[PDB]
Amino acid sequence: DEPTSSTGALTEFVKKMRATARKLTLPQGSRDWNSMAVRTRSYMEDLHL
Amino acid sequence: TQVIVSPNIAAVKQGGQQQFTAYVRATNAKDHKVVWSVEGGSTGTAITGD
Amino acid sequence: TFNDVKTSLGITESYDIVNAIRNSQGDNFKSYVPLATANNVAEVGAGILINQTVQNDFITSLVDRIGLVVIRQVSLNNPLKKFKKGQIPLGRTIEEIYTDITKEKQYDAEEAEQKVFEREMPNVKTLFHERNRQGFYHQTIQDDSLKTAFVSWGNFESFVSSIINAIYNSAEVDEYEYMKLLVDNYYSKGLFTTVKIDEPTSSTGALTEFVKKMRATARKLTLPQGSRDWNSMAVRTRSYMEDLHLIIDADLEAELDVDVLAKAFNMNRTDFLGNVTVIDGFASTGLEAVLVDKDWFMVYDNLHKMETVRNPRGLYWNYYYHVWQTLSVSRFANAVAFVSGDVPAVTQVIVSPNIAAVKQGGQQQFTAYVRATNAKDHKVVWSVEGGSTGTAITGDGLLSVSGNEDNQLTVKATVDIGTEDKPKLVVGEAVVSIRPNNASGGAQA
Numbered sequence: 001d002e003p004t005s006s007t008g009a010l011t012e013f014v015k016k017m018r019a020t021a022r023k024l025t026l027p028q029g030s031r032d033w034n035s036m037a038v039r040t041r042s043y044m045e046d047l048h049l
Numbered sequence: 050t051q052v053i054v055s056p057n058i059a060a061v062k063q064g065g066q067q068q069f070t071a072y073v074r075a076t077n078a079k080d081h082k083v084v085w086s087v088e089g090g091s092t093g094t095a096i097t098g099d
Numbered sequence: 100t101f102n103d104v105k106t107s108l109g110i111t112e113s114y115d116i117v118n119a120i121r122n123s124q125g126d127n128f129k130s131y132v133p134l135a136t137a138n139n140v141a142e143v144g145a146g147i148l149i150n151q152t153v154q155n156d157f158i159t160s161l162v163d164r165i166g167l168v169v170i171r172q173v174s175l176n177n178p179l180k181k182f183k184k185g186q187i188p189l190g191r192t193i194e195e196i197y198t199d200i201t202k203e204k205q206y207d208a209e210e211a212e213q214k215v216f217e218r219e220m221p222n223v224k225t226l227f228h229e230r231n232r233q234g235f236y237h238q239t240i241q242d243d244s245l246k247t248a249f250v251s252w253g254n255f256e257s258f259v260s261s262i263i264n265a266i267y268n269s270a271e272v273d274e275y276e277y278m279k280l281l282v283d284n285y286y287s288k289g290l291f292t293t294v295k296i297d298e299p300t301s302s303t304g305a306l307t308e309f310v311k312k313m314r315a316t317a318r319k320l321t322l323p324q325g326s327r328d329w330n331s332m333a334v335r336t337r338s339y340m341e342d343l344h345l346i347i348d349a350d351l352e353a354e355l356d357v358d359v360l361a362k363a364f365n366m367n368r369t370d371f372l373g374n375v376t377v378i379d380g381f382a383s384t385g386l387e388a389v390l391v392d393k394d395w396f397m398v399y400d401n402l403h404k405m406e407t408v409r410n411p412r413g414l415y416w417n418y419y420y421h422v423w424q425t426l427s428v429s430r431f432a433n434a435v436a437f438v439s440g441d442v443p444a445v446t447q448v449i450v451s452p453n454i455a456a457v458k459q460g461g462q463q464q465f466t467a468y469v470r471a472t473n474a475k476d477h478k479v480v481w482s483v484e485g486g487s488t489g490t491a492i493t494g495d496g497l498l499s500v501s502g503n504e505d506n507q508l509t510v511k512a513t514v515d516i517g518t519e520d521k522p523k524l525v526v527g528e529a530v531v532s533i534r535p536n537n538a539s540g541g542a543q544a
């Protein structure tokens with residue numbers, strides 16, 4: 001939902017943020033976040049929001 | 050599962066108006082309807098829709 | 100001199116504390132009941148204005164003396180003097196020039212064969228400031244008659260010094276009111292970029308919704324790429340965070356102070372993010388928290404001159420302290436006025452460089468920059484009021500004048516808001532002079 005629409009929608013956006021940014025930097029990686037669908041891994045110092 | 054009201058703590062001037070925002074936390078996206086109400090107070094203190 | 104007088108002279112006296120009250124009830128005024136000299140303290144204990152020659156209580160021929168002289172001194176300083184920018188001896192007008200960015204073209208070697216020496220004009224907007232105030236502060240000190248009023252030389256000098264400090268305070272009082280006036284001029288002329296807020300005094304949510312628009316606009320003003328909006332000339336300009344100056348009044352501070360900060364474990368995250376200065380004014384309606392660059396003020400100086408004459412026949416000096424200033428506002432700096440209450444849908448329609456100077460048969464595109472307040476509406480309606488019979492603007496800003504066009508034109512960018520039965524328009528304007536073509540003219544095939 002739009003995070004500017006409320007405060008309750010704002011914290012909802014943060015929980016979807018931090019959960020996603022942890023998924024990008026798991027040590028086993030995933031196929032779910034590229035578009036070539038390869039098992040890649042990000043690092044926290046590389047992610048730019 | 051629950052409903053979150055914006056400005057959970059509000060402190061409104063007499064005569065003033067605070068817009069409130071409901072945030073329906075759900076699983077199925079049915080965009081559920083809200084009924085607003087207010088407990089305590091006068092006859093003049095009455096909430097409207099939205 | 101003076102004959103008799105009452106003691107209460109300018110006293111309106113809501114209730115008589117002396118006889119009508121303290122002598123009357125057995126109420127909370129019982130703490131003042133046992134006082135023996137209370138009817139005297141309540142009488143002249145506010146100060147008196149007209150001095151009598153009160154006699155002495157024992158030797159009635161003697162008089163009572165003034166035992167102390169308390170000359171009280173004030174020093175009045177302009178809180179906005181840090182925005183003052185200099186002095187001009189010679190000249191009247193200021194030519195503030197902005198150059199703006201231009202548009203990219205595509206690389207093509209085959210076309211580059213024939214367009215080496217083609218020319219493309221820069222995008223340069225200028226604006227103009229000229230001298231505004233010319234005033235003086237007359238003061239007269241008649242030193243020799245004032246020797247009758249004092250006994251000490253140390254009090255005589257501290258009084259004649261005080262009158263010299265009655266001007267130089269008034270030169271700071273009136274300069275402050277003129278620098279507030281430039282703000283309310285700039286809002287009345289409709290030139291701030293208004294961010295519509297609620298009145299922060301009403302609900303503390305409306306206060307906290309105001310801090311969010313405050314910090315956002317401050318972050319938006321200082322984005323390194325700059326932004327076209329937030330100023331009245333509509334150029335791409337970039338503010339520095341140390342150069343933003345949030346000008347609130349004293350009430351809006353204590354809203355943030357008591358409500359927001361008091362209950363903030365992290366103070367810097369709900370901070371105003373500017374160099375917050377405090378006034379007690381803005382005078383208009385709903386206007387508060389004017390967030391400006393420091394280059395917004397174009398206050399210059401022209402004369403600070405104390406000129407004296409002495410009348411020798413009557414023993415006095417005249418003190419004419421002349422102040423001449425150029426009190427104006429740059430529009431190339433960017434300025435935001437958080438106006439509560441109801442504001443219009445469109446505040447202004449900024450148009451293209453308003454000096455187009457188009458040759459007969461030429462074309463010129465005019466770019467509208469609508470300063471809408473809320474979210475979206477408002478297609479622009481164009482117009483060629485001025486000369487005609489050939490002069491025709493399209494739905495975009497192309498002018499396409501004529502071969503016969505002579506008179507200057509007024510290109511209008513009209514935005515209709517409000518009611519269809521009384522259509523309130525926000526009409527931005529642009530001027531263009533028409534120079535003759537002189538080739539491919541006369542008659543034509």
